[PDB]
């Protein structure tokens, strides 16, 4: 269900490992059940610790 939604947001008919990864890692509970498990070809969720960003805000159109 979740990965299907992920593929739909991607404008994609087909579920791929990344759609399964995104589903699993943004679901607090599925993430715990599958937390010592590696999804081949899933990658990782976007995440950059705040102290590594620059701080200045001046924005987009």
């Amino acid at each position: 269900e979740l990965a299907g939604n992920a593929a739909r947001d991607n404008k994609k008919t087909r579920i791929i490992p990344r759609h399964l990864q995104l589903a699993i890692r943004n679901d607090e509970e599925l993430n715990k059940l599958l937390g010592r498990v590696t999804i081949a070809q899933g990658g990782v969720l976007p995440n950059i610790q705040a102290v590594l960003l620059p701080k200045k805000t001046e924005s987009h159109h």
Binding site: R18, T38, Q41, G42, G43, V44, P46, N47, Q49
Partner: protein, 98 residues
């Protein structure tokens, strides 16, 4: 004339590689390493191609995760730069290291 400040292209790459899922180590070198490490266990071994991919997938996942943990140790010491002690402390705390 034009040049980006240190850290800017770094952030750009972080964004780039967290967005994607391709393997980041080059495949043939990786394969050569596997074969080489394997030789110290059994001579003249063959490898299903998927078994090498399966090991690369795993390695790369292992390391990407270790770097996440390494970054946190760097930041805990009020640093932005990862250093070997950050990798060592992570590995110590994970139970991998004595």
């Amino acid at each position: 004339p034009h040049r980006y400040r240190p850290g800017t292209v770094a952030l750009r790459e972080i964004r780039r590689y967290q967005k994607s899922t391709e393997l980041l180590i080059r495949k043939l070198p990786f394969q050569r390493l596997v074969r080489e490490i394997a030789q110290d266990f059994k001579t003249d071994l063959r490898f299903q191609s998927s078994a090498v991919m399966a090991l690369q997938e795993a390695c790369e996942a292992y390391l990407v995760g270790l770097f996440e943990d390494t970054n946190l140790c760097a930041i805990h010491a009020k640093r932005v730069t990862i250093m070997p002690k950050d990798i060592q402390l992570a590995r110590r705390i994970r139970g991998e290291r004595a």
